[PDB]
Amino acid sequence: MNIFEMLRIDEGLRLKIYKDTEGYYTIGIGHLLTKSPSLNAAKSELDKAIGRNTNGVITKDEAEKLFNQDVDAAVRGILRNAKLKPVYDSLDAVRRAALINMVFQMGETGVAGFTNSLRYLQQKRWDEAAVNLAKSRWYNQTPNRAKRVITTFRTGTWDAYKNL
Ligand SMILES: [Cl-]
Ligand SMILES: [Cl-]
Ligand SMILES: [K+]
DSSP states (O other): OOHHHHHHHHHOOEEEEEEOTTSOEEEETTEEOOSOSOHHHHHHHHHHHHTSOOTTBOOHHHHHHHHHHHHHHHHHHHHHOTTHHHHHHHSOHHHHHHHHHHHHHHOHHHHHTOHHHHHHHHTTOHHHHHHHHTSSHHHHHSHHHHHHHHHHHHHSSOTTTTTO
């Protein structure tokens, strides 16, 4: 298991434009195109992203390319954030992957706001961190996925992704 396999499990793979859990146009392995209700708009972002006139469908390779870029961007976002960096630097590899996971899903800024959870994680108070993480809109809207991520932060193991 690794961050790529983990997020591939959590985001799935679709080669045609579709709507994510929040109703937003996305494609590939969780690549958000736009929050706009305009499909044309989404298509325009997709074409710009891929570099060709696609008509809303991409290949697996293309999808993987954006995914690699998105994972890298999540990492970069953590490293550049004053609140996330220290947390990430203080964690082991498995837990670091959990944090990357949340940032890919919600963006640097959104995760940076989980002040209290961040502090518990920095303190290595696993169970407390897990409880706190669950008190969120994130957990309520995507509970199965959140449970997986939280279990990963709680145990420092990939047990939640095992068998998937
Ligand atoms: Cl992009
Ligand atoms: Cl879910
Ligand atoms: K998805």
